[PDB]
Nucleic acid binder design. Structure first.
Ligand SMILES: [Zn+2]
Ligand SMILES: [Zn+2]
Ligand SMILES: [Zn+2]
Ligand SMILES: [Zn+2]
Ligand SMILES: [Zn+2]
Length: 143
DNA sequence: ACGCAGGTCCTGGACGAAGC
DNA sequence: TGCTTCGTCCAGGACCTGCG
């Protein structure tokens, strides 16, 4: 109030041109925090520090039940639900429940029947890119 | 067999919260 | 306060595993 500068990518408003220029980095990547190891860029320095653990192998979030360690606290939180049998994610179509939110999301796709991954060698179609990768290894073994 | 699909956890963008 | 840094959620994906 008032804001006269607009981003031509997401439409967000800004009161000063310097504010728009700083925000525009998220679309172009220019001058974003850049990892010195791999030179990929991230939205802020905290996301870069998280990414640094991919190079060091540091896993600072340890499960006190089994002793395994994880790179992110969210992953530890998801892992703890396995020990406690906590399955809060359920498919609304068939009722199958999961402790992992991605396992639930991946399962629900099967009710659509879509198989968008087609083997370039024989044309066999798969709902999962994983199954296509493993399938192509059979062609490599046959050849 | 091997297609199928669930188990598991790593990676990072999204975005409001907290820091300074 | 306003820009920076953080915590966290969440989506996606890589690799693993057993069933029928
Ligand atoms: Zn924008
Ligand atoms: Zn890096
Ligand atoms: Zn554990
Ligand atoms: Zn279902
Ligand atoms: Zn094939």
């Amino acid at each position: 109030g008032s804001k006269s500068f607009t981003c031509d990518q997401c439409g967000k408003y800004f009161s000063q041109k310097r504010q728009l220029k700083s925000h525009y980095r998220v679309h172009t990547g220019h001058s974003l925090p850049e990892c010195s190891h791999c030179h990929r860029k991230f939205m802020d320095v905290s996301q870069l520090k998280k990414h640094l653990r991919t190079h060091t192998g540091e896993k600072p979030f340890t499960c006190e039940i089994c002793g395994k360690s994880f790179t992110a606290k969210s992953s530890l939180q998801t892992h703890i639900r396995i020990h406690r049998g906590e399955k809060p994610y359920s498919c609304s179509i068939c009722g199958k429940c999961f402790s992992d939110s991605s396992a639930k999301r991946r399962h629900c796709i099967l009710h659509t029947g879509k198989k968008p991954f087609s083997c370039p060698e024989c044309g066999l179609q798969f709902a999962r890119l994983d199954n296509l990768k493993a399938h192509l290894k059979i062609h490599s073994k046959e050849k």
